[PDB]
Design a protein around this ligand. Sequence first.
Ligand SMILES: Nc1ncnc2c1ncn2[C@@H]1O[C@H](COP(=O)(O)O)[C@@H](O)[C@H]1O
Lengths: 170, 170
Amino acid sequence: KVILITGMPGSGKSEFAKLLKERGAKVIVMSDVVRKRYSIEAERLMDFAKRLREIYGDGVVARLCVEELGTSNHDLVVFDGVRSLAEVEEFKRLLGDSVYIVAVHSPPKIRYKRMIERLSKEISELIRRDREELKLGIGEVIAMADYIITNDSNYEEFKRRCEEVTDRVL
Amino acid sequence: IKVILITGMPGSGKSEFAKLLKERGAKVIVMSDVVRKRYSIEAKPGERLMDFAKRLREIYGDGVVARLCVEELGTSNHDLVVFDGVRSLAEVEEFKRLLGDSVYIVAVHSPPKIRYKRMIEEISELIRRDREELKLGIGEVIAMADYIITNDSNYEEFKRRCEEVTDRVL
Ligand SMILES: Nc1ncnc2c1ncn2[C@@H]1O[C@H](COP(=O)(O)O)[C@@H](O)[C@H]1O
């Protein structure tokens, strides 16, 4: 049983990842995986990830994350940060038929405000960055999701929504 | 005037949200109906609808259907309007350029297997049609939505979810 978590920047998707860590799931952050490769073979992080997808194909990060998983039994595996259907397709080829996409949604202005409130923050730059993420294919993953969780109110409503999706998946 | 843009994948029940608004008294313009009107004056004999839709975008740019839908509205109309079936962010931007900044995107979500299950009661064809809709840019509209309504249980819960969103918009 595998959960692929996707969401736009500032959606709070890692909060869903955190809730799954607490329930005993193996959680693998896809960017942590690319970063391990980066320290070895880097050059900004986005630049190195681009080179990987050109050399090895669009599903590369999924292959890398499966390597990181290794050969072990887990009740629940979670991959936090899926960006394309090419990745989803590699997770399915490698891990089988019990793979689910969960998107965490927040409208653009809410996400922008969360990011601007962090401890560039120009609105034009946050807009350009959504657009780069969309060009990688994240909108296609969201549109084809098994579950979409809205994070547009408080933490406690979000946590309840996360819990009920988890129950449906399990 | 308030502008409600409805987006969703084939078999998602986006038309049911449109229906509900229509039933409340809203002016609902169906984007594919506007395409069919153009079809009767510009299409090649026997041309597939999706093929014609792609050719209009080649000739007039990615925002055409929105422009056509605004011309359908008329300059003389200043009431709330609903456009059923937005396919891309280029359409959204055209609606904003022409009708201003009270523009709301509501996505109706259903997961792939559920939507396919509804339509069948040819699978590779359906998957193919989904791929064409994604290439038009529908996933980016969903990813950037103000509200995502999930239709994955029964009609009544879906209706209550639609009512809540429409209350927030009004
Ligand atoms: N913005 C648009 N909205 C809806 N339909 C469109 C648009 N542009 C082209 N079309 C054509 O209309 C078909 C049916 O639309 P719908 O009735 O919403 O499923 C689509 O698959 C397209 O081929």
